[PDB]
Design a protein around this ligand. Structure first.
Ligand SMILES: Nc1nc2c(ncn2[C@@H]2O[C@H](COP(=O)(O)OP(=O)(O)OP(=O)(O)O)[C@@H](O)[C@H]2O)c(=O)[nH]1
Ligand SMILES: Nc1nc2c(ncn2[C@@H]2O[C@H](COP(=O)(O)OP(=O)(O)OP(=O)(O)O)[C@@H](O)[C@H]2O)c(=O)[nH]1
Ligand SMILES: Nc1nc2c(ncn2[C@@H]2O[C@H](COP(=O)(O)OP(=O)(O)O)[C@@H](O)[C@H]2O)c(=O)[nH]1
Ligand SMILES: Nc1nc2c(ncn2[C@@H]2O[C@H](COP(=O)(O)OP(=O)(O)O)[C@@H](O)[C@H]2O)c(=O)[nH]1
Ligand SMILES: [Mg+2]
Ligand SMILES: [Mg+2]
Lengths: 51, 426, 43, 427, 45, 426, 427
């Protein structure tokens, strides 16, 4: 005999399966704004070095 | 670095604290066996605030367990994340209080409060830069309210500089669980107003109808309610644990919410909250979180903010966003319903931002409101106290332990003075 | 005797001022010496 | 010639993070400290192929400081140059001015002393901070007064962040701002105003960024500081130094508060559209919509102005532009100062940052002037300070931390005296 | 003194029982966590 | 090199020595059959201090076992590691003293000490440089107190310059076995205060308290207490057996703890000591050792040091460690509670470091404190002695053997002057 | 050129016990009284190798007098100056002024006559009292009135210790204070205020002792008095006698109440942390954090200021510091006074005592000024005195002693007149 204290309670209260950001995707704003200028490849349009 | 010492008292406090520790452990990516199994390195740099590394990645929570009846400790240990709490932190009596503030505050606390003081001291000097104390307990009960409040007094006496933050559940008109709610509640708040730094009032009926409307659950047992309380509890301290654009610790929010020493009774809510069948409607946008944050139905106290005036407010934002939109929405909500805000203070709302949303979300916001409409709950308590004290019902169980009626007079007069001040500043 | 301690600090201050002036002169010499070489390299 | 800069508070060290990124990028210094003579004013050369900035980051909260320590620029910054306290001051002038500031300023000035000793041609100091908080305002004013005691004769350029009229983030910032001005009056040499609402509007209007954040604001502040330091950094047709701002833009010792503007504020796609030239970029730097402080210069009266020019600039064009401005009657100069313009030209055009939204412009103008609308800004802040001090709100925090109510009234009266001075001068 | 030894014995017995129950109840919680973690796919940069 | 010869007296001494020899043999890697099977070469260089090479890697302990009843020897031989003791070392009487000081000190000692003296002189002269003697016995029994005391006096008369340790257990009123314990205890102490070089007092009630509260064991048999005593005794002579960053021999400990030759009664503690349930949740650092070493509830004597003054103190440390942290912790504990240390002796703590920890451990510590609170138990025994001697109870068994009233009177006279000087120096 | 001292009450004679110890260690005289020209102003040479202070200890209780008799300073004082009463005034102004004072004042007077006769160039007197007590209020007033009758034209240094507003040990001390101010207002020429909580803050903040007893307060008061008298005992580059004080610090015959201050006030470990100059001790002598009396001088306007400097000071730096203080806008002087300053330098630096809490400092500053905040102090005391008087509390023992309502009404009216004078002179 056992009660109902053992519940996941995460999917019942707080969850947004479509809008979740995976824990590997976590990053601070400064981390995402100050990239190595030599090999910055996270921007679609940028000034390419043209010799 | 800045250290938070968690304290748990009574059945309600023990269960909500177990839920809080489950949520925090999940957020920092440690499995119920005590070892780290996350992926992002952002978690490990700020785990000292809530955990201590013993051996081989065994991170032990910095919590204290306190009660008098074996059932609650048994429930805490039997469930998952039960074998991570330190066995020595289960300081624990055996007789029980049973809905009596005097029993838990003068007799049982007499021979139990010394061991808990030894444990909390040993665990407090264990850390270098202590930030403050965070406690969660009950008020209508005997063990949590009385013994917990006396411990609050003791640790305020010994540590007069470190901050003190409380989550307390309060009596309710329709859902009235026990019979001696007014006697315990009045003395609990009487001590809290003079000793606690800031209090966030909780009640079960607000959680009940939050599960009714927003989540549309059918049978919301204590687990969901404690999970919501834990979500807010973690959202309060998210600044110390993660980098952000504008951090705000407990002192930053307390100086921006407390204009007078006795003006430290807040009310709380959480965003976003939607049903499982409505997961695709809402886009995680600042206006959508803001509109739910300011709604009276999202508040976690039986006090309508529309029946009073906001004095100060605090907003704790998480996740990557833009400050301009948050500030614009804050100004917009301040300007439109300007009749609901105080006049002799500009910029009543304080904001803060962090870049790490809680797990399972995209971005969240936590609201702390120092509204003057919380006096309605106190007047509700006082009228029942005066009516029941009128013919001294159930009094002999209190004066038979050492107490006098003068303590009841002091509690009633002090809380009446507090409601008078709240009405004055409206 | 009433001004012996004052005379001591007067001597102290004048000696320190002379030393600082000498150090400034040395700094000027170093500056011009480096200037000549860098300009020659540029030429 | 060299200048050493100090960054105080969460705003100060973030704007410093943007500014030093710009400094490293413009001189072609890769983020690990070495090149792949003009750099000497910012980067000290050590050993063989290694440059260390002449700056310090200090704060009472270690979170953002050590996050910078573990950012892209790890080897670039000296480990001891990033001071970090152990606990926050939490929006309190008293906490950062008497309690925690007392044991941190000694280390900061001990490091600054050796940083300046390593220097040989120091021009002066250059401070970035925010007065709306506690860590910034309190210990920044304390450090400022201590440096004034130690050096004094060396200039100190001030770039502060006051709270905006409508948009704000805190509740008790009037106290911190007032007590910050109470010391900035006698200790800061040249103060350059920086708001936040104005730059938000600039970003939304010119760069059409619908959701701007603090990063764009700091990038624009870095643009401004680089444009005003390029005269010392690089050779131009007419060079100016630090002393020029004091000599030509500070008419009275108690009147030093500056307005900033920048042009051309344009995106990457509209550089294709418009034909850039000296006349229109000079004209655009005068409307209130291109000013970095939320104020209307029409209600005020100019005293003196400074103009930095970068890129392909011929002096005849700037002379024509300033003559046309002088003949214009929409703006009004004071008869007090018949000649209220100061110019300066540098040859190198402003640099661009990858990921930034500012385009590569042929020429740019940074306009820094003095006006009387700053008294209006201070009066507007004073209005809500007096409206809030009437109820003795939040005083107990400051009193318990170690302060009393007296200096609140004294700083209020000092601000009132400032108001009277600006009213008298504007006549 | 007999009361103290009885308290010790019951505390030890209940520690062992609680440990056994916790180890028994851990596995379904892990299964549930796996099930609701499978919903979130990590992104590719 | 430096040599330690072991002497055991009575049933308590024999069991303590059996456990001590088992622990030491485990440390040095010899099997219960007596042959070396260790791994490192550090376990060969300093094993002459305890063992003697026989043949083919067989090492025999340097011990002499004393008793008066066949049961103790039979149990010693029957148990494990009982086949390593040399049978000639089993010096052995036949009749038994049986809880009577006079029998073991005047009658039974007369015909037995000759064989004990013969064997101890034979073994002691076999080694080149005897570091000193070591004796573990009891003050409650007859053959342990009286015969052991007679042997102590005889050794002091024979080899005067050599060192001498006395691990003597003193019975307590709360845990009391024998009726006539004060009669043996007072006279044994009266002889020890002039005979023994330095004494470290053990007590069974303190060991029971330690094994109840700290180890959290439910059935603390004599095995656990003997294990604790054996660990303490092994910890003392660790520097002689292994290299360290700062070595300290027995004389080096004695010179730093005895400012006056009649004050040689130490109170002893050991650390770390944790329950098996709480073994995972503890980090293993120098502060964790220092905070438990100075705890009053960890001491293996029946005397609270908080009621007295730490006149001198000592600490033995084992493991690869930092001397800076050891010194900083010692200075912190010295400067925190300045009221518990005497004023005319600054820097009362002597520290030593060994880099070889006990098997199964990474760090350990031992405490030897010469406090003036050791005179609490002396009064606690002398009060019973005066209360019973005033009526000449059980005296006819002592008088009718050679002893008279003068021995008793001088016994409480020396007891009183010892306790009086200990109180004076407080 | 000499001056003699008298002591009345517990506080006065304890302060004197500190002062004479300090003086003896200043002049190298052992407690026996033998030295193994400057001392002539306080000590008269007796016999062969003996010196006796120009002092008299007077009190009604015999206790503190007899521990003075039995202490280490037995042979220092001539025994028959040590005058002891029999029963105390019991914190009762009427009792000490009419019951016990009538029979002891005669002995004090015919002792002062011979003490002055032994002197030749007596400049004046210096008294020590606290107007909070009973015997220091009543019989002290009677005695000083008798000296005013006897001498009239001679100066009298009135060193009074007023009770603090919040911190208080008695309950009827407002009445004693008012009844003392009735006579001290028009009898003595110079009066100095000494508050108790201000010294508590002084020893808490700078002297960094959290458990201060009366001994340290007495030590620092003795240091202040020694600094004031150093211009008398020793020759300086710019000396001032007692006489110049009356004509330089008292603008009106009824306004004679001068505040006290001292600098630098540093403990044993602070002296090593910083090195001293004249500018910062001049500035620190004017901040209210080092003032000896509960007041807010920033609310009021200064009348005049006296500055005694000891140690190693030259007139150039003091003149420059005075100019800088005058140019400061934090403190404002009254319109009719163009220069409210008075400087002074002595060559002999202040001393330190083994066992004391002060450090060996090269130079020190004693500050004595005059402002209108003392009027605020008087009004604060008078309000709380009138608060009790509305119900005739504690008055009837004064009545039964022999007094009536008349002097109480006259004292309240005289204090109101003093309030009106203070508010009218400040315009
Ligand atoms: N423009 C701009 N302003 C900033 C930035 N960071 C902080 N601020 C301003 O700083 C004000 C509050 O001070 P904070 O920077 O949060 O911190 P602080 O000044 O050091 O004071 P404390 O919070 O008590 O530590 C806010 O109102 C912002 O306007 C930034 O990156 N850019
Ligand atoms: N600075 C200082 N003030 C003191 C000292 N002792 C007493 N006082 C002050 O004197 C006031 C009361 O007078 P007392 O000195 O105690 O005694 P008294 O002046 O002889 O008057 P009675 O006690 O009535 O005989 C108190 O309010 C104190 O503030 C002291 O040692 N130092
Ligand atoms: N929200 C919430 N409330 C709880 C929980 N457990 C108990 N409570 C409340 O706590 C009250 C009883 O308090 P009690 O346990 O008797 O306090 P104690 O006697 O001091 O230990 C009831 O009214 C419950 O509503 C919980 O897990 N969640
Ligand atoms: N610590 C410890 N104490 C013991 C042991 N064996 C006996 N004792 C104590 O010794 C006392 C009796 O000593 P006893 O056997 O008469 O010694 P003997 O007669 O001289 O051999 C009892 O009170 C026991 O508590 C042991 O193995 N360890
Ligand atoms: Mg900050
Ligand atoms: Mg008195």
């Amino acid at each position: 005999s056992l009660g109902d204290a053992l519940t996941a309670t995460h999917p019942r209260v707080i969850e947004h399966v479509q809008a979740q950001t995976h824990a590997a995707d976590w990053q601070s704003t400064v981390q995402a704004t100050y990239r190595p200028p030599s090999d910055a490849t996270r921007n679609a349009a940028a000034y390419v070095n043209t010799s | 670095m800045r250290e938070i010492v968690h304290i748990q008292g009574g059945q309600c406090g023990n269960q909500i604290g177990a839920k809080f520790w489950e949520v925090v452990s999940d957020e920092h990516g440690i499995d119920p066996t005590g070892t780290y199994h996350g992926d992002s390195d952002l978690q490990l740099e700020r785990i000292n605030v809530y955990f201590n590394e013993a051996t081989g990645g065994r991170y032990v929570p910095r919590a204290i367990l306190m009660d008098l009846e074996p059932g609650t400790m048994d429930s805490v240990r039997s469930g998952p994340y039960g074998q991570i709490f330190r066995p020595d932190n289960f300081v624990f009596g055996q007789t029980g209080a049973g809905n009596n503030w005097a029993k838990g505050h003068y007799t049982e606390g007499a021979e139990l409060i010394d061991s808990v003081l030894d444990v909390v001291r040993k665990e407090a000097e264990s850390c270098d830069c202590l930030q403050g104390f965070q406690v969660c307990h009950s008020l209508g009960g005997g063990t949590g309210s009385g013994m917990g409040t006396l411990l609050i007094s003791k640790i305020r006496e010994e540590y007069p500089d470190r901050m003190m933050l409380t989550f307390s559940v309060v009596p309710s008109p329709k859902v009235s669980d026990t019979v001696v709610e007014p006697y315990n509640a009045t003395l609990s708040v009487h001590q809290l107003v003079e000793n606690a730094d800031e209090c966030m009032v909780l009640d079960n009926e607000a959680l009940y109808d939050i599960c009714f409307r927003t989540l549309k659950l059918t049978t919301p047992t204590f687990g969901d309610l404690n999970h919501l309380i834990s979500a807010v509890m973690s959202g309060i301290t998210c600044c110390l644990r993660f980098p952000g654009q504008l951090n705000a610790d407990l002192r930053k929010l307390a100086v921006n919410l407390i204009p007078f020493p006795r003006l430290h009774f807040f009310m709380v809510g959480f965003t976003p909250l939607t049903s499982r069948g409505s997961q695709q409607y809402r886009a995680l946008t600042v206006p959508e979180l803001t509109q739910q944050m300011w709604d009276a139905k999202n508040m976690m106290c039986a006090a309508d903010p529309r029946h009073g005036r906001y004095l100060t407010a605090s907003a704790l934002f998480r996740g990557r966003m833009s400050t301009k939109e948050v500030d614009e929405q804050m100004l917009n909500v301040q300007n439109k319903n300007s009749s609901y805000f105080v006049e002799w203070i500009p910029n009543n709302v304080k904001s803060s931002v962090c870049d790490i949303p809680p797990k399972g979300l995209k971005m969240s916001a936590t609201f702390i409101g120092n509204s003057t409409a919380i006096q309605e709950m106190f007047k509700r308590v006082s009228e029942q106290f005066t009516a029941m004290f009128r013919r001294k019902a159930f009094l002999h169980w209190y004066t038979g332990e050492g107490m006098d009626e003068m303590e009841f007079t002091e509690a009633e007069s002090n809380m009446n003075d507090l409601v008078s001040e709240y009405q004055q500043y409206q | 005797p009433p001004d012996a301690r004052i005379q001591k600090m007067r001597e102290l201050e004048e000696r320190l001022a002379n030393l600082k002036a000498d150090r400034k002169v040395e700094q000027k010499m170093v500056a011009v010496a480096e200037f000549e070489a860098r300009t020659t390299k540029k030429i | 010639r060299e200048v050493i800069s100090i960054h105080i508070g969460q705003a100060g060290i973030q704007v410093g993070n943007a500014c030093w990124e710009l400094y490293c990028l413009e001189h072609g210094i890769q983020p690990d400290g070495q090149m792949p003579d003009a750099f000497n004013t910012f980067f000290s050369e050590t050993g063989a192929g290694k440059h260390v900035p002449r700056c310090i980051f200090l704060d009472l909260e270690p979170t953002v400081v050590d996050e910078v320590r573990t950012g892209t620029y790890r080897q670039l910054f000296h480990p001891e140059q990033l001071i970090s306290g152990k606990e926050d001051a939490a929006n309190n002038f008293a906490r950062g001015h008497y309690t925690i500031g007392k044991e941190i300023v000694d280390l900061a000035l001990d490091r600054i002393r050796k940083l300046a000793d390593n220097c040989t041609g120091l021009q002066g100091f250059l401070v970035f901070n925010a007065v709306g908080g506690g860590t910034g305002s309190g210990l920044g004013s304390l450090l400022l007064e201590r440096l004034s005691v130690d050096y004094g004769k060396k200039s100190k350029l001030g770039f502060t962040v006051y709270p905006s009229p409508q948009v704000s983030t805190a509740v008790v910032e009037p106290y911190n701002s007032v007590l910050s001005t109470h010391s900035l009056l006698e200790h800061t040499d040249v103060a350059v105003m920086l708001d936040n609402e104005a730059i938000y509007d600039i970003c939304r209007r010119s760069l059409d960024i619908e959701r701007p954040t603090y990063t764009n604001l700091n990038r624009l502040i870095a643009q401004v500081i680089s444009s005003l330091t390029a005269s010392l950094r690089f050779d131009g047709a007419l060079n100016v130094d630090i002393t020029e701002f004091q000599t030509n833009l500070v008419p009275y010792p108690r009147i030093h508060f500056m307005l900033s503007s920048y042009a051309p504020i344009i995106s990457a796609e509209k550089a294709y559209h418009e034909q850039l030239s000296v006349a229109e970029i000079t004209n655009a730097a005068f409307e209130p919509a291109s000013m970095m402080v939320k104020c209307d210069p029409r209600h005020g009266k100019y005293m003196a102005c400074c103009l930095m020019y970068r890129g392909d600039v011929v002096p005849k064009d700037v002379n024509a532009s300033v003559a046309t401005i002088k003949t214009k009657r929409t703006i009004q100069f004071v008869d007090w100062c018949p000649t209220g313009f100061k110019c300066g030209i540098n040859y190198q055009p402003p640099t661009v940052v990858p990921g930034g939204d500012l385009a590569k412009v042929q020429r740019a103008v940074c306009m820094i002037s003095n006006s009387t609308a700053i008294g209006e800004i201070f009066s507007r802040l004073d209005h809500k300070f007096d409206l809030m001090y009437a109820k003795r709100a939040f005083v107990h925090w400051y009193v318990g931390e170690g302060m009393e109510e007296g200096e609140f009234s004294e700083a209020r009266e000092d601000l009132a005296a400032l108001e009277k001075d600006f009213e008298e001068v504007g006549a | 003194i007999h009361m103290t030894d009885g308290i010790r014995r019951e505390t030890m017995k209940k520690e062992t029982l609680a440990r056994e129950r916790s180890l028994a109840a851990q596995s379904p919680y892990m299964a549930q966590v796996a099930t609701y973690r499978a919903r979130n796919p990590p992104l590719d940069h």
